[PDB]
Design an enzyme around this catalytic site. Structure first.
Site, PDB file in Angstrom:
ATOM      1  N   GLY A  52       0.822  -1.201   0.000  1.00  0.00           N
ATOM      2  CA  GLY A  52       0.000   0.000   0.000  1.00  0.00           C
ATOM      3  C   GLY A  52       0.858   1.253   0.000  1.00  0.00           C
ATOM      4  O   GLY A  52       2.064   1.171   0.227  1.00  0.00           O
ATOM      5  N   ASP A  98      -9.741   5.147  15.397  1.00  0.00           N
ATOM      6  CA  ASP A  98      -9.799   4.863  13.975  1.00  0.00           C
ATOM      7  C   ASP A  98     -10.212   3.421  13.732  1.00  0.00           C
ATOM      8  O   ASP A  98      -9.738   2.782  12.798  1.00  0.00           O
ATOM      9  CB  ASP A  98      -8.450   5.144  13.314  1.00  0.00           C
ATOM     10  CG  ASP A  98      -8.554   5.222  11.806  1.00  0.00           C
ATOM     11  OD1 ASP A  98      -9.677   5.073  11.288  1.00  0.00           O
ATOM     12  OD2 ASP A  98      -7.520   5.431  11.140  1.00  0.00           O
TER      13      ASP A  98
HETATM   14  C1  LIG Z   1       0.727 -10.678  -1.697  1.00  0.00           C
HETATM   15  C2  LIG Z   1      -0.735 -10.229  -1.421  1.00  0.00           C
HETATM   16  C3  LIG Z   1      -1.261  -9.690  -2.757  1.00  0.00           C
HETATM   17  C4  LIG Z   1      -0.758  -9.069  -0.420  1.00  0.00           C
HETATM   18  C5  LIG Z   1      -2.140  -8.706   0.111  1.00  0.00           C
HETATM   19  N1  LIG Z   1      -2.006  -7.682   1.119  1.00  0.00           N
HETATM   20  C6  LIG Z   1      -2.049  -6.390   0.729  1.00  0.00           C
HETATM   21  O1  LIG Z   1      -2.164  -6.105  -0.439  1.00  0.00           O
HETATM   22  C7  LIG Z   1      -1.866  -5.362   1.766  1.00  0.00           C
HETATM   23  C8  LIG Z   1      -2.189  -4.038   1.506  1.00  0.00           C
HETATM   24  C9  LIG Z   1      -1.995  -3.052   2.444  1.00  0.00           C
HETATM   25  C10 LIG Z   1      -1.442  -3.408   3.656  1.00  0.00           C
HETATM   26  C11 LIG Z   1      -1.107  -4.734   3.934  1.00  0.00           C
HETATM   27  C12 LIG Z   1      -0.503  -5.132   5.200  1.00  0.00           C
HETATM   28  C13 LIG Z   1      -0.232  -6.418   5.675  1.00  0.00           C
HETATM   29  C14 LIG Z   1       0.349  -6.243   6.870  1.00  0.00           C
HETATM   30  N2  LIG Z   1       0.817  -7.105   7.773  1.00  0.00           N
HETATM   31  C15 LIG Z   1       1.323  -6.568   8.809  1.00  0.00           C
HETATM   32  C16 LIG Z   1       1.435  -5.143   9.114  1.00  0.00           C
HETATM   33  C17 LIG Z   1       0.964  -4.331   8.177  1.00  0.00           C
HETATM   34  N3  LIG Z   1       0.930  -2.983   8.181  1.00  0.00           N
HETATM   35  C18 LIG Z   1       1.196  -2.172   9.249  1.00  0.00           C
HETATM   36  C19 LIG Z   1       2.430  -2.174   9.862  1.00  0.00           C
HETATM   37  C20 LIG Z   1       2.670  -1.368  10.957  1.00  0.00           C
HETATM   38  C21 LIG Z   1       1.698  -0.536  11.465  1.00  0.00           C
HETATM   39  C22 LIG Z   1       0.484  -0.527  10.869  1.00  0.00           C
HETATM   40  O2  LIG Z   1      -0.417   0.293  11.397  1.00  0.00           O
HETATM   41  C23 LIG Z   1       0.217  -1.338   9.770  1.00  0.00           C
HETATM   42  N4  LIG Z   1       0.405  -4.897   7.059  1.00  0.00           N
HETATM   43  N5  LIG Z   1      -0.088  -4.234   6.054  1.00  0.00           N
HETATM   44  C24 LIG Z   1      -1.319  -5.695   2.972  1.00  0.00           C
HETATM   45  C25 LIG Z   1      -2.835  -9.939   0.670  1.00  0.00           C
HETATM   46  C26 LIG Z   1      -2.835 -11.056  -0.380  1.00  0.00           C
HETATM   47  C27 LIG Z   1      -3.708 -10.646  -1.567  1.00  0.00           C
HETATM   48  C28 LIG Z   1      -3.455 -12.348   0.193  1.00  0.00           C
HETATM   49  N6  LIG Z   1      -1.459 -11.301  -0.727  1.00  0.00           N
HETATM   50  O3  LIG Z   1      -1.483 -12.505  -1.481  1.00  0.00           O
END
Ligand SMILES: CC1(C)CC(NC(=O)c2cccc(-c3cc4nccc(Nc5cccc(O)c5)n4n3)c2)CC(C)(C)N1O
Ligand SMILES: [Ca+2]
Length: 264
Positions: free
Chosen positions: A15, A127
Site C-alpha cells: 500500500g 480509527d
Molecule cells: C501478496 C498479497 C497480494 C498481499 C495482500 N495484502 C495487501 O495487499 C496489503 C495491503 C496493504 C497493507 C497490507 C498489510 C499487511 C500487513 N501485515 C502486517 C502489518 C501491516 N501494516 C502495518 C504495519 C505497521 C503498522 C500498521 O499500522 C500497519 N500490514 N499491512 C497488505 C494480501 C494477499 C492478496 C493475500 N497477498 O497474497
C-alpha cells in the site's frame, strides 16, 4: 528496538497512502515482516515513530506486534506480518466471500477481544474500522494502525479542533464536539460489524456524510444491512446508543459475539 536497515530486504509493496508505503519483506533472512516507510515531509519522523512507541506499550496477541524501527530516514516501522492483509479487502477475495456467518462472527469476536485489552489499558484507538484490521494466514484478526490512538487518563480525549475524521465510522459526540472515549470506539465497532456482514461494503451505502449526520440527529441509525442476522443488528444497535455511557464494554461485546458464533 532499533536495528540496522541492512537486516531488511524489501520484496513486495502492499500500500502507499498519504503518509508512506507498506512493504512485505524479510528480516535477518528467514523472518517474514511488514515494513512501513514514511514519506519525507508527510509528518515529522517523531510523529511517525509515535505509533511504534505506543505499540511497545500495547502488546497482545490480538494486536499487531511491533518488531523494530529504523530511525534514520527513510524511517521504518517493522512489524509482525499478516499474510491476508486488510480485512476490508480480504472479505471481498474469493476466500473472504465464501466465509460463513459463523466465521465472520468469530472474526468479530476476535476484534472485540483485542479492543477489550486496549480498553483495559486505558487507551482509545479512534480509527476503528475494517481497513485497519489485519488478517493472518490462519484467518485470525489483529488490530493495527495506532496512529490516532491515545491514552485517556481523564476518561475522555478532546480532539484538536480542525481535526477531520471518517464521519461514517465516528460517534456523534466525537464529530459534533470532538470528544472521544472508549464508548466512542464502541460506536466505530458497530459500524465495523456492518462492514463484516456486507463483506467490506461502505456503511450507509449511497448516502453523503452530512446526510448521515442529519439522520443520526433525527435519531436514525443505519438501515438493516442486507442478509444481516437480526440479533447481530440489535447488538450493532447497542453500540449506537445516544448516550455514550449506555454503550456496552468491549468485553461484553466479545462475550455475546462468542455466544453468537457458538450458536451456529
Ligand atoms: C501478496 C498479497 C497480494 C498481499 C495482500 N495484502 C495487501 O495487499 C496489503 C495491503 C496493504 C497493507 C497490507 C498489510 C499487511 C500487513 N501485515 C502486517 C502489518 C501491516 N501494516 C502495518 C504495519 C505497521 C503498522 C500498521 O499500522 C500497519 N500490514 N499491512 C497488505 C494480501 C494477499 C492478496 C493475500 N497477498 O497474497
Ligand atoms: Ca482467494
Amino acid at each position: 528496538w532499533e536495528v540496522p536497515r541492512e537486516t531488511l530486504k524489501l520484496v513486495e509493496r502492499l500500500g502507499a497512502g498519504q503518509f508512506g508505503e507498506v512493504w512485505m519483506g524479510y528480516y535477518n533472512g528467514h523472518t517474514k515482516v511488514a515494513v512501513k516507510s514514511l514519506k519525507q515531509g508527510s509528518m515529522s519522523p517523531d510523529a511517525f515513530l509515535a505509533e511504534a512507541n505506543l505499540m511497545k506499550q500495547l502488546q497482545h496477541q490480538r494486536l499487531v506486534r511491533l518488531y523494530a524501527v529504523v530511525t534514520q530516514e527513510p524511517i521504518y516501522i517493522i512489524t509482525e506480518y499478516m499474510e491476508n492483509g486488510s480485512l476490508v479487502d480480504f472479505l471481498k477475495t474469493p476466500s473472504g466471500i465464501k466465509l460463513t456467518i459463523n466465521k465472520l462472527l468469530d472474526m468479530a469476536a476476535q476484534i472485540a477481544e483485542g479492543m477489550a485489552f486496549i480498553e483495559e489499558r486505558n487507551y482509545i484507538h479512534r480509527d476503528l474500522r475494517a481497513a485497519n484490521i489485519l488478517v493472518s494466514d490462519t484467518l485470525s484478526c489483529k488490530i493495527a494502525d495506532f496512529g490516532l490512538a491515545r491514552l485517556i487518563e481523564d476518561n475522555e480525549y478532546t480532539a484538536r479542533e480542525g481535526a477531520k475524521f471518517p464521519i461514517k465510522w465516528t460517534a456523534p459526540e466525537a464529530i459534533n464536539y470532538g470528544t472521544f472515549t472508549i464508548k466512542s470506539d464502541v460506536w466505530s465497532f458497530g459500524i465495523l460489524l456492518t462492514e463484516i456482514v456486507t463483506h467490506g461494503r461502505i456503511p450507509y451505502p449511497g448516502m453523503t456524510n452530512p446526510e448521515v449526520i442529519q439522520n443520526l440527529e433525527r435519531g436514525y441509525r443505519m438501515v438493516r444491512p442486507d442478509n444481516c442476522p437480526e440479533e447481530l443488528y440489535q447488538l450493532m444497535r447497542l453500540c449506537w446508543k445516544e448516550r455514550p455511557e449506555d454503550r456496552p464494554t468491549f468485553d461484553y461485546l466479545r462475550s455475546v459475539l462468542e455466544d453468537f458464533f457458538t450458536a451456529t
